[PDB]
Amino acid sequence: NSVFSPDGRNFQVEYAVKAVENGTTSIGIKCNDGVVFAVEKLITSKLLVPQKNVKIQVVDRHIGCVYSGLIPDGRHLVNRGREEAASFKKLYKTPIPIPAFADRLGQYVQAHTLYNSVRPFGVSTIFGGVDKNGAHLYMLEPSGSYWGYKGAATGKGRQSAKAELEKLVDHHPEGLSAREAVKQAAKIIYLAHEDNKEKDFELEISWCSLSETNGLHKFVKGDLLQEAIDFAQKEIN
Amino acid sequence: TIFSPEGRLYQVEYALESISHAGTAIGIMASDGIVLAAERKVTSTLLEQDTSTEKLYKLNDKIAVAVAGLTADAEILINTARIHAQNYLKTYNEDIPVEILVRRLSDIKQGYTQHGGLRPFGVSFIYAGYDDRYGYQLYTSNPSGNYTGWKAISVGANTSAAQTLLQMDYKDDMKVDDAIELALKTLSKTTDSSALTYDRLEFATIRKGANDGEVYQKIFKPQEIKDILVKTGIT
Amino acid sequence: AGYDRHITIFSPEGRLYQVEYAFKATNQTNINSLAVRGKDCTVVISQKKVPDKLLDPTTVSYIFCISRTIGMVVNGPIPDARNAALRAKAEAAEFRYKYGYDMPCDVLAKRMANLSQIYTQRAYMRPLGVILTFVSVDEELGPSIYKTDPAGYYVGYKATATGPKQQEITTNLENHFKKSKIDHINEESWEKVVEFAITHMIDALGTEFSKNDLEVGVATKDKFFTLSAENIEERLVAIAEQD
Amino acid sequence: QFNPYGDNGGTILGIAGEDFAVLAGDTRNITDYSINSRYEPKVFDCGDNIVMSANGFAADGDALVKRFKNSVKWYHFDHNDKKLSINSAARNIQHLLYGKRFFPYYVHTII
Amino acid sequence: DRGVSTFSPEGRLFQVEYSLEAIKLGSTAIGIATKEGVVLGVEKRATSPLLESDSIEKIVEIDRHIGCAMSGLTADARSMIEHARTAAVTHNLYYDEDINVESLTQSVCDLALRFGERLMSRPFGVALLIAGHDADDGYQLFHAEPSGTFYRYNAKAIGSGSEGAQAELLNEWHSSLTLKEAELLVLKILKQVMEEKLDENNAQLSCITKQDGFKIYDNEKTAELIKELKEKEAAE
Amino acid sequence: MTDRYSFSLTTFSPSGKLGQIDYALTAVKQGVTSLGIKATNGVVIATEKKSSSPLAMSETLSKVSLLTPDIGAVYSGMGPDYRVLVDKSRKVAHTSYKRIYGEYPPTKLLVSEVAKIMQEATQSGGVRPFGVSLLIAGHDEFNGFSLYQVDPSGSYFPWKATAIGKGSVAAKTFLEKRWNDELELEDAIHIALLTLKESVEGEFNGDTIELAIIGDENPDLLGYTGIPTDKGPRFRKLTSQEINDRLEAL
Amino acid sequence: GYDRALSIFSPDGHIFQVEYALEAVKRGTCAVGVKGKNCVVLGCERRSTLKLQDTRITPSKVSKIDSHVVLSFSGLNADSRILIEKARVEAQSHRLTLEDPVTVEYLTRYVAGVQQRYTQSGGVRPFGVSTLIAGFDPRDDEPKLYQTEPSGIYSSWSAQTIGRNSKTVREFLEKNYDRKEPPATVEECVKLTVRSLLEVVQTGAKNIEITVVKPDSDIVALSSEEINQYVTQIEQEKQEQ
Amino acid sequence: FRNNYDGDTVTFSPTGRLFQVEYALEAIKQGSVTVGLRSNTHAVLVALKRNADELSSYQKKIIKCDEHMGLSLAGLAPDARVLSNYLRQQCNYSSLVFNRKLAVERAGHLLCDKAQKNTQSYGGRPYGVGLLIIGYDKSGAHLLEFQPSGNVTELYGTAIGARSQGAKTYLERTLDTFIKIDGNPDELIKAGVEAISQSLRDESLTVDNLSIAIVGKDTPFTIYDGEAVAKYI
Amino acid sequence: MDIILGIRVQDSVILASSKAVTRGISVLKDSDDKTRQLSPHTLMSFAGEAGDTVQFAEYIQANIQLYSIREDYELSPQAVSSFVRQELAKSIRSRRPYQVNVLIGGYDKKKNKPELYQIDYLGTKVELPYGAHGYSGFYTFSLLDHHYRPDMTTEEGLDLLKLCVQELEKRMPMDFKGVIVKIVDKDGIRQVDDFQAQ
Fold first, then answer.
1. Separation of alpha carbons H230 and H209, rounded Å
2. What residues make up the domain containing H124?
3. What is the CATH number of domain B1-235?
4. Of F29, G100, G213, I142, which is most buried, counting CB atoms within 10 Å of its CB?
């Protein structure tokens, strides 16, 4: 891990990436006043209680977090993001801005690539929210690398998902609405499920929009979830 | 600090091996004093010999050491031996008995032999000292933490040859001047150089202070080695 | 799998492979940077490549405001770049608190150099795969450029360049100062120094730039700032009506 | 200066019969000349057929009763659900109290 | 050749498995639980006739109601016995009562885990038979391995002769064995598996009873049980 | 986080070698040549300022460093290793000496301390030895002028004149011929300039050569007047202008 | 903090580091202990590769722990000092807290305990030492002899030997030592001790040494001449056809 | 690709796998079978205990954690002791500090996070035990499955250990029957006992063979052994 | 409070120490030996605070005995006294100092001279022909200033002490229940247990 290979890469990070590519597919979509998050949940067995194995996670009250790879590694990371948000709030009063939150996760993940006694994280995390100046979406790789995104995808069907996202970006230069991005996210997860379909799946979406949630993170439940499942089931038949 | 299948200590054996290539040092014990003599590792014309010291170190006023091995590793140990002597003196208002200072240094060495994962010190010491319990004493310690007392002994390069010669010419009723002579002769025949010159030597004695009833430590000046080299028929 | 390939111990030829591999990492982003000094300013230019259409271009940067007065451009992967950025910001803020004046460009360079030296010597820390270029108008020294690498080396520069095509840019710049006979750009406005910098970047790389292909940072007395795309466009329009 | 202690009044009474025992207390809780509560219980059933009251400084009493109730819970866990005999509770309560020999619970306790 | 707390592809801890091999190299210990008491017996296995057999201490008291026999690298058992004694005495101090046999065994097994804050470099090279009596669950026998796992047994054998001895314990054990019968059986099965001929100096018996606690049987009393086993197994 | 390798990375091999110390010395061999010559009223230490591109500013690189007002150092091998030894050396001259005795340490003793720092990197866990050899020139009231070499093992020795790095073999020989025990300081400078000419390939001027002296006290470098009991530092860096002047009469 | 486990199990269930410590003991010079009716005698040997030694100042192989107990060893000399110091501290500590000097057994159990701990601690190697510990319990006349080995095991011995060629001398002692009749005198106890050493040493010269321990802190070391009296008596007495 | 990559938990294989974790998972397979299932009013654990000898005890496999929660183990038993102990403290902390019974879901997350650290530390090792967690809290009955990888999932029913797949198949088909067994404790246990049987080449499950645990609406977590389970065979 | 006297004659040192141990209103013991043998030729007497007194003495005793067995050699009285001093000097600046005053009487076999060291709880050391701790010195010093001679026999030394004791029984407020007297000479340490009704 604290080992460069002769090509200048870090082989332990490179292998962690493989674990991510091996994971369930998850996405984020930035909209004009917010961000939407969605994930694919493989129904291993009918014995799984539906809607009861929540994957998306909240940080503070305004940040959403979703990931692919080693689920425990994602949970470890969110716990640290939570302490990091709390510490910022305690001292600076204001809730942590998304760019600031991104670097906090960034630096922590990067530290696990510096020492031979630690291993890197086996997740790519898509996260974001609404702060003092607009909506922000980010994706963070096992190397600690992150950037701002219009749309983001990671996991087994990342390629098809990225393709869909690129199509949305190019065909909506004016910007997408939160309500629309919610349906669109449902479409893209179903479309992305094509590359991981030796098993049936359950869809989970969350969002953070200024006009739809007052800038708070919230899960999409009930009617609005069904409306999206319906919209997605339609445009695959 | 691991055992071999045979029950030897790898890093210790290899440290002794390292020492076997260092400039030779001899200690000779007399009825009326002790000689310490050491040969400098392949030197040069431009190397200063005036402000130079590399093999002979004063521990307190009654004890000196000759060093075979890594000079820097030895300075570490000399420093703590000096401190240990002063703690003993502060505690008891009496100069440290030679054996006690030696046991302590050997114990330190032994430590690097049993725990910690650090390499041993690549050093062997000859100790020359006087106290009022045992009189003149000559000791040896090596990286294994082992120590023993001697009438005459050598460390470093060519110990086999050196030891043969000392065994041949040493006798219990020797005086210090005969021991000085024996020391230089033994170095004369075990050198790896052409001939033995003054600038390749360090020399020290621990005598009964000429006229006083007190104990004196003499670390020979360059000229004093040069002079003592003449009388003995080596020039 | 010899140990001298994996940790920072010496090889039989007295080398540190891990450090060598860290230098290799500095080119991973396939970006070139250069720095030049004006009369009373300092300019850094770096290529900006946004391949993915999904990225938000405004967040893709390799230039960093270390303090009010010091900027830093990094050549190397972003995680290591940001780690070095955070540390330099901390170091510069601490220095000002402890010593009552702004940390000079060269002192921060030296401090970062020493930190990198440690990773060069201690087994448990890998070096950072980065080259850091620090720029300012120093209150004692004037326009300043100081550059550090994974070996722990650092030096001041009249001008410099870093990246895959470093050599081409360097010799291009050497040839400019060879002719001009001075050690700076004899220009009063920073705008013209930027214009110089971009012009010589174009020449050495054989490439035309649009406003989104570049990144510009300027240091003046009591401020370091970065240019917006439209600032850069205005700079690109001016080089067109001349060159 | 901060005084870490107070006095909440109260009075407790234990009587042992041949095949029964009672532990009684008043339900009044006081500070100085004021009534805090007319009904604040201070005699507690602690499981294993043990009743307990720690009277004096009510904060200390509550802490001690909590720690003993927990003690009983963990005795069950560590000793295969064995019933904690009354003599055994007593001894355990000695150790709880004495653990604070140098910053005591200001209570008189009866079980 | 990579780690101490490492798993094999089978899902076993290498070092724990190898510690068990060390136990198989040790002297035999046997325990038999009855409703009249529990008997523990051991093979002394003196390495020489000059070794004073009395100084071989492989059966030890833990408390008046708890005894223990060891097998394997017996030097490793010292800190285990010390911890068991402390745990039992401490329990009496805190609770005015005797520690339960299971609880004491569980405590010893907690100690065993602490290899790899984990201040111990390897597992123990010793197994223990822990026998005792308490009011709740009566007479009990436990086998405590250096894994931290323990097992209750009606009868159990550990050491070099354990494979043969355990099968013999299977045929012989029934829920109505008296204390005197149990003593004879231990001696018998020991006689079978011991590389030497069983007498009062190379074997040792002990028992724990409610009334009298843990007693080690002295040589004179054991020789009699021998000079009675030989006679019981002559008529048949 | 935290440190794992708590064991020595320098160990004895069956032949009794300490590998990492040998390899450190090999690194020192590749280093640019540096030298020191002791006079009767001075010491000179000198080295080449090997520039990496003419865009680099040579003056900003310190190869010859002041350790105390009367002690200087130069090196061969790994520059960044040297730079951190200079910082620790300067600081230890204070913590281990000046804050105790109110005077700067004598040359041999500061040399001893540096040697300690280097020995420790030979034996501590998780570290490699320093890849430098140092030449330390200084003066103190009771020993006068001295010159010492410190190597990666922590070993040190006093020299009348010597050289380390690339062209050391040839330079040692050059010095042997030219050194007598009666040399004035100006003679030692001139001899140093001659010796350094063999090693250098490209340009050989005052901007590619670094040279410092330990000579007389420099009262004008003190910073203040009014206490006649000190007249300033004996260490002095020769200026680029001063080096060139001596080259014209070479 | 270096706590890398050095003493570990092999698949056959052996701790090789402990095993190799025993090999260092076998390498070490021979030591023998034999206990009579009212005494215990210890005996050692000296090596030959150098003999320009000083006799007065070189550490003897028998060490007093307290005034009534002694310790002898085979194995690494430097290792044995550490055990001897720790045993001496414990003997003083026992006096201070119990107001009684150690029993020979207690001192043995302590030293064996120390050796054991070094077999299961991260970043330490076992003691390359095996010890014989002898003396008398305070206010007691029954003689005591014990042996400890690197593993931490200890036991009492009517007579025992350790070190190089201990195999041969244990052979001798097994034939010659009678349980029913221990060497009833100090003189005839030293007799069996010299005979047992003679198989390995060569000459009764500057190599064989003896120490006698009697009850109530009575410990006398022998001189070359008094040993030479036992040497001369047996070689020519036990040679006849 | 399988070679020098199973040394410690701090190392990924080129595939992206963590082998020491996978090997820990393997200790479950070699463990005696246990079954979990719940309705809307109760949750049940059935564990088949395994003996070392005919003379031995059938090693206990169900551990109570609070009055409303408990678990069953398959694999390294000492590891189930470390983890249930941790769960006892966490349940305890929730009571003392907040006067709040700990949600089964929170218990899940806590166990996950504890196991996770051991998949990322140096010189540590992953846990080698699977755990079935049942409870009754403010949102009714729950069953959880804990894997030493740190993955926890909530299910209507499941099984772990030796030939678990037999019981897991049966439970997959019986789903709509057992979930409706509300306010009828004995029929939920029976459905659990008949579930554990689909995984027995062993035999007739005896009196010492069986261990049962139940928690629910007005039933505190209680373990039945021997005598009290005879009526379920 | 307790009497601790020391007198150095020509060939021996004599220590005299009171036998009473008094707590509050009661004399609890009238036969206390306020002394520890440090080595065959070195004896220490002590007075001061109730607990500290014996703990310190016994701690010093353990240390000297350890040194003896380690070196198979007896430390000189001067070396023992310096050890004791440094201990007290360290103690005085610790969290809870030892409140113990001592006299050390030893015979130096190498020098063939008797020696007496007086050391208070602060670690204040001095060598003297005669010494005392506490109030008793307010009587004895002047008495011995007068009657003492440097070349006295041991028997004369005991009569000198008799005077010292007698004066203290006349003028001290407290009943110290007589003294135990011990002699340290070339032959070691013996007790003159017959001094009280002599």
1. 10
2. 1-233
3. 3.60.20.10
4. G213
What letters, b where the CB count within 10 A reaches 16 and e where it falls short, cover G146-178?
A: bbbbbbbbbbbbbbbbbbbbbeebbebbeeebe
On whether any CB of chain F is under 8 Å from the CB of G122, the answer is no
| Residue of chain G whose alpha carbon sits nearest to that of I57 | G96
F122: Cβ–Cβ under 8 A, 6 or more apart, which residues?
B72, B73, F10, F18, F20, F21, F129, F152, F153, F154
| CA C60 to mean position of chain CA atoms | 16
Number of independent structural domains in chain F? 1
* Sheet of A26-31, strand order: A151-154, A26-31, A34-42, A201-209, A218-219
Six token digits for residue I93: 């600046």
How many domains does one find in chain H? 1
* HSE toward the beta carbon, residue H139, CA cutoff 13 A: 9
Distances (CA, A) of G177 to B54, C166, E222, G172: 58, 89, 27, 8
d(CA F193, CA F188): 9
Q: What angle do CA G68, G73, G75 make, to 5 degrees?
A: 165
B90 touches chain I (CB under 8 A): yes
CATH number of the domain within which A121 lies: 3.60.20.10
Max Cα-Cα span within chain F: 63
Do C127 and C19 meet the contact criterion of CB atoms below 8 Å apart?
yes
Cβ within 8 Å, pair A48-H150:
no
Residue type, I86: Q
3-class DSSP state of I56: helix
The answer to whether the beta carbons of residues E112 and E84 sit under 8 Å apart is no
Query: Is it true that domain E1-236 has CATH number 2.60.120.10?
Result: no
Domain of residue F83 covers: 1-250
List chain B domain ranges: 1-235
CATH of the domain at G162: 3.60.20.10
The radius of gyration of chain C from alpha carbons, rounded to an integer in Å, stands at 18
Written in H, E and C, the secondary structure of B41-90 is CCCCCCECCCCCCCCEEECCCCEEEEEEECHHHHHHHHHHHHHHHHHHHH
Q: What are the φ and ψ backbone dihedral angles of H135, each rounded to 5 degrees? A: -165, 160
Find the Cα–Cα–Cα–Cα dihedral D73, D74, D79, D81, rounded to 10°.
20
Q: Which two tokens stand for residue A233?
A: 């089931």
Distances (CA, A) of H203 to H161, H200, H224: 17, 6, 20
In chain A, the number of structural domains is: 1
Please state, in angstroms and rounded to a whole number, the distance separating the CA atoms of residues B124 and F14: 18
Q: How many domains does chain C have?
A: 1
CATH number for the domain including H22?
3.60.20.10
Which residues in chain E touch residue D90, judged by CB atoms under 8 angstroms apart? 96
Q: Which chains have 3 or more CB–CB distances shorter than 8 Å to chain H?
A: A, D, E
In whole angstroms, how large is the CA radius of gyration of chain D?
15
Is residue A24 part of the annotated active site? The answer reads yes
Per residue in I38-50, is it b (16+ CB within 10 Å) or e — as a string? bbebbbbbbbbee
- How many other C-beta atoms are found inside a 10 Å radius of the C-beta of residue F94? 13
Interchain contact A/C (3 or more Cβ pairs less than 8 Å): yes
CB atoms within 10 A of CB D75: 20
Mutation for testing the F interface, residue in C4, C7, C36, C155 having most F CBs under 10 Å: C155
Tell me the torsion sign for CA atoms G199, G201, G206, G209.
negative
Q: Running DSSP on this structure, what letter comes out for residue G126?
A: P
Cα–Cα nearest to C66, from C134, C114, C162, C117: C134
The total of structural domains in chain I comes to 1
Radius of gyration of chain H (CA): 18
Q: Strand I26-29 relative to strand H42-48: parallel, antiparallel, unpaired?
A: unpaired
What gap in Å lies between CA A182 and CA I177, rounded to an integer?
101
Bridge partners of residue C155, in order along the sequence:
C147
Among D91, D93, D97, the strongest candidate for a mutation testing the E interface, having the largest count of E CBs within 10 A, is D91
